[PDB]
Structures are given as C-alpha cells and as structure tokens.
Design a protein around this ligand. Structure first.
Ligand code: FES
Ligand SMILES: [K+]
Ligand SMILES: [Mg+2]
Ligand SMILES: [Mg+2]
Ligand SMILES: [Mg+2]
Ligand SMILES: [Mg+2]
Ligand SMILES: [Mg+2]
Ligand SMILES: [Mg+2]
Ligand SMILES: [Mg+2]
Ligand SMILES: [Mg+2]
Ligand SMILES: [Mg+2]
Lengths: 86, 97, 135, 100, 137, 49
RNA sequence: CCCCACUAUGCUUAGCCCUAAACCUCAACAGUUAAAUCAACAAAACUGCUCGCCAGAACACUACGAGCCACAGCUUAAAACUCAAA
C-alpha cells in the first residue's frame, strides 16, 4: 500500500508474447511460495494441523532427497555386463 | 622397537572446513546492498539457506538484519530495491524465461 | 547321527563331543588334521554387535612424520605434473624427492621449519627439478 | 635383516601418495566392454572410464593412460544402514594416453 | 540491447517508449479475478477512470459470472470503451486467482489493446485477519 | 532314459570338477564358451536356427 | 452439512477456575556397550540408586467423606451386587 507500484511481481512483455510473460510471472510466484500461500490462506488451518503438515512435508523432502541420492549412487554400475557368461 | 611403525598425531592432510560467503564479516542492518542480495527481486521474500548457501549463523544474522532494516526505514519489504538488481548474484535461484 | 547346530560351539567341539558319546562311529577325515594343526581362533559363531555410547573401534589412523612435509608440499607446490606410477614399487615422486632432501637437511642440524622448507626447494631447483608454486 | 611389514607400508608409493583426490596416476587398460574401459592404476579397485571421442581406437587392452584420481573406493552410507554401500570401483577421470 | 523483464524504474533515463509515452504514462488495466466474478477497470496514469466492465455488467449471472468465457467477454467490453477514449497500450495489474485471471487479459487483447507488462497485486497478509473456517464438504 | 552313470567312482570322488554345481554339463559348456571369447580378444540367418 | 447477518468467546486490564491424547504415551540422577541382543510392537539392550505408582474385568474421571474464590465444578477416591474372563 505504502510501497512503490509496478516493481513487485511485475514482468515485461516481449514481442507481444503475453502467454510467455504470464507463465514467467506464474513461475516466479510459484517458486517464491505465493501461489501456494494464497491457496492455504483461503481457509484457516488450525495450528495443530499446520505443524503436522509442515512436519510431513519436511520429512518427505528429506526422504525423497535421500532416495534420489541412493539411486544416483547405485546407478554407476548400470553399465553393460563385463563378465557375461560367468 | 621399530622406527617404521606409524606414529600418533592429527591428520596433516585434513582440509579446512567449508565457509559461507559471509563467514568472518559483520552483517549490519544499514548495509542494504548486502542484505538485498538475499531477497527475491520480484517479491522481496527472504531466501532460505538452501538458496543462499549461508550457514545457520549467518542465515539468522541476515534474516534479523533484513527485518530490522525493513521496519526501521532502510529496506523495502515487498520487493528488492531496483538499485541493487545489478549486484553480484550469489543465490542459487533461476527465475526468468 | 550328528549336529547341525552351527551356532553351538564349533565344528570341532561338536564333532569331538559326538565322537565321545558314540554317536559318530568314525571321526571325519579332517578331524585329525584340525587337532594337530588347529586354527589360531576356534571357529565359534558370534553375533556382531553395534557400538553405543563411549565405545569406539581400536583401529588407529596410520600417520608418519613425513606426512607433515607432504601436506605442506602439496599446499605450496600442488601435485606434480609428473604422474604417479604405482606399479613400480620403487617409484619416487617429486614430493618424495622433496621429503628426502628435507630429511637430509634436518639431520645436518637445522631445526627451523620455515627455513628448512625454503632451502629444500632451492636444492632441487639446482638439481634441475621443476617446482611451480600453485599461487 | 628381513624387511618388516611396517617398512614396506611406509615406503610404498600408495602410502607416499597421500590423499588420492586430484592426483595424477598412470593406469593400464586390462578389460574392455564396448566403450567402457576398465583401468587398473595400482589400487585395490579398478576404475571404469568411457572411451574418449577423439582417438578412441588408440585405447586398447594394455594401453597405458593418464588418470586424475577422485576416490580409491566409491562408498556411501545411506539412511538406516549399519555399514557403507560400496560399488567396488575407484573414481577417476581419464585424461589421455601416456607416451614416451 | 537485450530484453529486460524488469520494468523501467521511474526517475531513471530509459529508452523504452510506447507511442511516445513513457512507462509511467501508460494507462493501467486493473483486473480483479474473484472466485465468482471478474472486474476490469482501465484507468489513466493519473488515476482517471476510462472504462469498466465485469461479468455481471455483461449480462452473466450467478454461476455464469465466474467462468473464463465470461471474463474474456468482460475484457472485450472494457477494451472497447477504453479504445474509444484513446487507449492502445495498457499495463495489467491483476489481483486474485479466479478463473478470469488470464482470460480477462486475453479479452483486452482481442479488443484492440496491447499489454506491455503484467503485475500481480493479489493481497497476501503478512500474519492480518483470521480467515473463515474450512467448509465441511 | 540316459541318466548319466554314477558321477563318482568307488572312492566317492566326483569325476567332473563342476559336479557340486548340480549342472556340471551346462556350466562346463558355459565355461568353454566363455573361455573362447577370452582367447579371441587376446588374438584380436535364414539357412539355420 | 452449504450461504448471509450477528452474539458469548478469541484481545486488553484486574481477579478467579486448575482441566487436556497437559503424550518423546520414554520418572530423576549416574554408568555401560561386554555379556543373553531381544516375548511382540514401539524407541538398540542393560546396570546402580532414589522417589512416585501398580496388583483380574466391570461397577468407577462413580457413591460417600474431606478440601477448595470452584455451586450442572475440581482434587482425592471406595463398596455391594455381577462375571471367567478383561
Ligand atoms: S561458515 Fe563461518 S559464519 Fe558462516
Ligand atoms: K503424542
Ligand atoms: Mg464480539
Ligand atoms: Mg495483540
Ligand atoms: Mg502439548
Ligand atoms: Mg521425580
Ligand atoms: Mg526380536
Ligand atoms: Mg480392578
Ligand atoms: Mg475429567
Ligand atoms: Mg467427581
Ligand atoms: Mg461430594
């Protein structure tokens, strides 16, 4: 309200490509967490429920990052069989 | 006994521990140029340490400095000051097209 | 008649006992050899346990006095552009050549570390060795 | 005057090398599977490097090559594991061929 | 010069122009994309109203006021009244995630207006009023 | 059915060195083919089914 | 259940009331990783020491008594009848 306008969340259109400008803006708001924050703010999440989800999300990220690391590590040996026939 | 036996000591080949870009430097709430490097250009959102690469201590100092600078009249809240858009990009985030 | 309780004693103890009890009419072909030339440890099943609290493995890191010289040499001059040949058991790298000269000069009575390191580089340069400082 | 094991270990090139990260070593191709080169460089485990695009035909069984070592044994401990997972191979980057 | 998605900053000396007008002088299309309606007001850089259209003013009612085709129709209507007043280039400021958020912008273009920038001003409270309780459906 | 004669003599020693695999003939063939592939490296359709 | 409006209430102040799945459902302190690793599951298995607590189910977060700014309240907390399970 008290800030300058046309600086925050503002994307310029290139060569009249408004679809790409809108997608860029949508990607910015998504990465910064705004799109998902507006949605969660439509109805009140009860504090006990917010902690449960924030803890589930935190643990799914740790589990997915750890499962990706394991697959990358064990994919080094995906090469062809060096001792075929034995 | 025997001269060629191993000897007890600390690892001589040990490498120094990693350091964040701001390790050893004072973070002041008046240094808005530095603080602006860790907020989103479009939304002013403070970046998490997974984007800034800062350690827990400096992530906290930067966060506390930003919050102080914002409410004391030194730093905008809803966007990165456009004067600082051409500063070195030290954050691991890719936005445009 | 026998025993397949592999976690109860060892094949020797189980075999010896059943021979005494008359369960085994004949000793197996290996029994007399084991008795004459037994292993250092009797092969008894054990369950490996996980360490907790203040329990730590007794294995020690292998270090040598020359490792301090090697750590400094790699920091100052980096790894030599010459390639290690680990197949030759008598291979000498630039670092090992540096360490040997560094050891000789220390035995000549010099005790300073920063001075004993600069004089060593000069000696090798005189001998034709290439020492390109990393920085 | 029989050399002890402690003496062999102290004066072995592998001991003298120190850490293996970013160390240039000479390897020998001992097994080839398509474009996968299996190279022994004097360690416990071989490394596997893909045939270079340039002068690919020069890399044959017995060809001696230059490597930049990264790890002598690729191992990692994953969450909920009591020991380390090992792929039983060294990590190295193939630079080229060694010539006299 | 390379294209910058960042808008020109007022007070600096930019070379960008639209019909000889600077970014600060281009009229603004304010799109309110609600869940059940879409409202579009075009104003001048001095905040003079030039055109207004919403799905309700275009004859859509009740569950029809909140669709993509209804917002697109409202955009065309606002573009027509704005074009008569001399508007060609507009800056779009959209607040809300309703169904007419993007469709309302298309209608403005089909109506003859050229969008030079897009700004989101969806209200996000930084801690604010407590929202209503979840609907039990 | 040509079940092979007892695969060991009177002393009980099997004749074939791969007896204890249970598939000595199959693995003896795989061993011979794998060995030929090795020797070639050291050295280096419609008609039938 | 959905929509609209609105109240006690959520806030502040000054007093009360004293409850929770008040739960890491893990008492405090100290020690150990060797023995047998260990009913099961949870959350690797234990030792010393101390306090608190428990002794079939249900009756029963009940009755009576007592105390309490509590008055349709809280704390402490039975018995009879009944069952061969819980
Ligand atoms: S790593 Fe030292 S302060 Fe961040
Ligand atoms: K709980
Ligand atoms: Mg009220
Ligand atoms: Mg308040
Ligand atoms: Mg709680
Ligand atoms: Mg206590
Ligand atoms: Mg068990
Ligand atoms: Mg009872
Ligand atoms: Mg109660
Ligand atoms: Mg009561
Ligand atoms: Mg009473």
């Amino acid at each position: 309200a008290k800030h300058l306008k046309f600086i925050a969340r503002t994307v310029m259109v290139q060569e009249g490509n408004v679809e790409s400008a809108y997608r860029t803006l949508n990607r910015i708001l998504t990465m910064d967490g705004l799109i998902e924050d507006i949605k969660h703010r439509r109805y009140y999440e009860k504090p006990c429920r917010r902690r449960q989800r924030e803890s589930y999300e935190r643990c799914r990220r740790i589990y997915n990052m750890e499962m990706a690391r394991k697959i990358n590590f064990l994919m080094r040996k995906n090469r062809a069989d060096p001792w075929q026939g034995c | 006994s025997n001269e060629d036996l191993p000897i007890s000591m600390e690892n001589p080949y040990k490498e120094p521990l990693k350091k964040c870009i701001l390790c050893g430097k004072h973070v002041d709430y008046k240094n808005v140029q530095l603080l602006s490097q860790f907020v989103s250009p479009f939304t002013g959102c403070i970046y998490g340490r997974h984007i800034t690469g800062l350690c827990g201590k400096k992530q906290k100092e930067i966060t506390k400095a930003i919050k102080r600078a914002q409410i004391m009249g030194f730093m905008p809240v809803t966007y990165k000051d456009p004067a600082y858009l051409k500063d070195p990009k030290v954050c691991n985030i890719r936005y445009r097209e | 008649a026998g025993s397949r309780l592999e976690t109860v004693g060892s094949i020797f103890s189980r075999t010896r006992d059943l021979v005494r009890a008359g369960v085994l009419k004949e000793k197996p072909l290996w029994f007399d050899v084991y008795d004459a030339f037994p292993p250092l440890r009797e092969p008894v099943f054990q369950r490996p346990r996980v360490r907790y609290g203040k329990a730590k493995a007794p294995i020690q890191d292998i270090w040598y006095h020359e490792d301090r010289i090697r750590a400094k040499f790699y920091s100052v001059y980096g790894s030599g552009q010459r390639a290690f040949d680990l197949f030759n058991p008598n291979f000498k790298s630039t670092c090992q050549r540096f360490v040997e000269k560094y050891t000789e000069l220390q035995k000549l009575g010099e005790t300073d570390e920063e001075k004993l390191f600069v004089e060593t580089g000069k000696a090798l340069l005189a001998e034709g060795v290439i020492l390109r400082r990393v920085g | 005057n029989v050399e002890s094991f402690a003496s062999m270990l102290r004066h072995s090139p592998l001991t003298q090398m120190g850490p293996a990260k970013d160390k240039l070593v000479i390897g020998r191709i001992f097994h080839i599977v398509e474009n996968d080169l299996y190279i022994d460089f004097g360690g416990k485990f071989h490394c596997v490097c893909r045939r270079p695009e340039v002068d690919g035909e020069k890399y044959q069984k017995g060809t001696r090559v230059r490597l930049r070592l990264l790890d002598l044994e690729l191992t990692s401990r994953f969450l909920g594991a009591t020991t380390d997972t090992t792929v039983l191979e060294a990590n190295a980057v193939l630079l080229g061929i060694q010539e006299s | 010069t390379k294209f910058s998605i960042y808008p020109p900053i007022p007070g600096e000396e930019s070379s960008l122009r639209w019909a000889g007008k600077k970014f600060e002088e281009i009229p603004i299309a304010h799109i309110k994309a609600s869940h059940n309606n879409t409202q579009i007001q075009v104003v001048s850089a001095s905040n003079e109203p030039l055109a207004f259209a919403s799905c309700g003013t275009e004859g859509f009612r009740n569950a029809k006021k909140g669709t993509g085709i209804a917002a697109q129709t409202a955009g065309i209507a606002a573009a027509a009244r704005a074009k008569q007043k001399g508007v060609i280039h507009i800056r779009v400021v959209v607040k809300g995630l309703g169904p007419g958020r993007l469709s309302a912008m298309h209608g403005l273009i089909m109506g003859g207006l050229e969008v030079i920038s897009i700004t989101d001003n969806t209200p996000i409270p930084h801690x604010g009023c407590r929202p209503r309780k979840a609907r039990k459906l | 059915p040509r079940q092979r004669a007892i695969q060991w003599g009177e002393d009980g020693r099997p004749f074939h060195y791969l007896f204890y695999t249970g598939k000595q003939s199959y693995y003896s063939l795989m061993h011979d083919v794998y060995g030929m592939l090795l020797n070639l490296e050291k050295h280096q359709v419609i008609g039938s089914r």
